[PDB]
Structure 1
């Protein structure tokens, strides 16, 4: 009679909360999805071994079109868990799955876990200063989407930081790199000539957040566009003007150049 939405955290199998693990261990069935994101620092095998339950993986269609035919029926007469990378209900379409549960006469509870939305705090940027967030998407065929670029302009205009998720093909395991995102943005800039993202723009790159050894780097696009930030996933952040303390952190902790202490403050 209960469905548990349990987050797995940021990077590996230990990023799940003690509450999340203990509850999942007492469930009769355990589902998971890895289409909204992947746990780059672990495997399904390691996650199963830790929970001690076999985990049936679901596709985007399994969830989006048949959550009520696949997961909810079992939740009617058992304790069922639905695992997802990060914090549950962060992924735009997930909240409504709770409405489905309600409609099916199933109770649902949410066990939270670390999300990249809060993990970026490790970049030293004050979290209250973040504005609208967006995802950078790959152009394709006759379609060049550029709204993420307009958002950077609108946020920075107001002194707000912009968090940019990079496109991902979880099935193909093809991640967009911070480098590809920057070059995409330089291309969009050349098209709109808006002066929003150039070689002189200051950006922050966060890779493998959650890991004990994440890669935190800050600098101008002209020097970072070709730097190796390691293995995915990659998160890109275009900061609005900086508070002196944020700059000091980026310089001391993320190796940013002294120049931002006068140029971007």
Structure 2
């Protein structure tokens, strides 16, 4: 009679919380999805071994179209868990799944875990200074979406930082690198000429947040655009005006050029 939305955390099988692990171990059925994101520092097998339960993986369609026919029925007479990378309900359409549960007479509870939304705090950029967030999508055919460029513009204009999620093809396991995101943004700049993203723009790249050895790099596009940030996923941040303390952290921890102490503060 109960559905548990449990977050898996950031990177590996140890990123789930003690609460989430203990609750999962007591559920009769355990489902999971890796279409919104993947756990790059681990495998389904390692997650399964840790929880000690077989984990039925669900596709985006299984969830979006048939959550009520695959997951909820079992929740009527058993304890069911639905695992997702990061923190549950962060992915835009997941909150609605709780409404579906209610409509089915199923009680649901949320077990939180670290999310990239809070984990970026490791970049040294103040959390309150982040503005609207965006996702960089690949242009395709006759479609060249550029809204993510306008997000940066509106944020930076108000001295706010912009968190950018990079395109991902979960099933194809194809990632967009921070390098590719930068090239795309430079191409968007050439079209819009807004003076929003150029070779002189300061950016921060966060890779493998959650790992004990994440990659945190900060610098100007012209120097970072061809740098190797390692294995994904990559997160790109275009920070607005910098607090002197933010800049000092970026210099001392993220190897940023001391130039930002005078140029971006």
TM-score (ref. length: structure 1): 1.00
| SS at 1:183 equivalent | helix
1:34 alignment partner in structure 2: 34
Q: In 2, Cα distance between the equivalents of 1:62 and 1:171?
A: 14
Q: In 2, Cα distance between the equivalents of 1:77 and 1:105?
A: 11
Q: In 2, Cα distance between the equivalents of 1:58 and 1:243?
A: 43
1:32 to partner: Cα distance: 0.1
1:45 to partner: Cα distance: 0.1
Question: Cα deviations across residues 201-223 of structure 1 (Å, max 9, x unaligned)?
Answer: 00000000000000000000000
2:208 corresponds to 1:208: yes
Question: Cα deviations across residues 72-115 of structure 1 (Å, max 9, x unaligned)?
Answer: 00000000000000000000000000000000000000000000
| SS at 1:258 equivalent | coil
Question: Cα deviations across residues 226-254 of structure 1 (Å, max 9, x unaligned)?
Answer: 00000000000000000000000000000
Q: In 2, Cα distance between the equivalents of 1:9 and 1:152?
A: 27
Question: Cα deviations across residues 23-58 of structure 1 (Å, max 9, x unaligned)?
Answer: 000000000000000000000000000000000000
The CA RMSD measured in Å over matched residues stands at 0.2
Question: Cα deviations across residues 146-173 of structure 1 (Å, max 9, x unaligned)?
Answer: 0000010000000000000000000000
Q: In 1, Cα distance between the equivalents of 2:207 and 2:199?
A: 21
1:248 alignment partner in structure 2: 248
Q: In 2, Cα distance between the equivalents of 1:221 and 1:239?
A: 12
Q: In 2, Cα distance between the equivalents of 1:112 and 1:164?
A: 22
Q: In 2, Cα distance between the equivalents of 1:33 and 1:117?
A: 19
Q: In 2, Cα distance between the equivalents of 1:8 and 1:14?
A: 8
| SS at 1:57 equivalent | strand
Q: In 2, Cα distance between the equivalents of 1:111 and 1:153?
A: 35
1:256 to partner: Cα distance: 0.1
1:88 alignment partner in structure 2: 88
* Runs of 4+ with deviation above 2 angstroms: none
1:15 to partner: Cα distance: 0.1
Q: In 2, Cα distance between the equivalents of 1:24 and 1:259?
A: 49
Q: In 1, Cα distance between the equivalents of 2:143 and 2:108?
A: 39
1:194 to partner: Cα distance: 0.5
1:16 to partner: Cα distance: 0.1
Question: Cα deviations across residues 110-129 of structure 1 (Å, max 9, x unaligned)?
Answer: 00000000000000000000
Q: In 2, Cα distance between the equivalents of 1:68 and 1:116?
A: 28
1:56 alignment partner in structure 2: 56
TM-score (ref. length: structure 2): 1.00
1:79 alignment partner in structure 2: 79
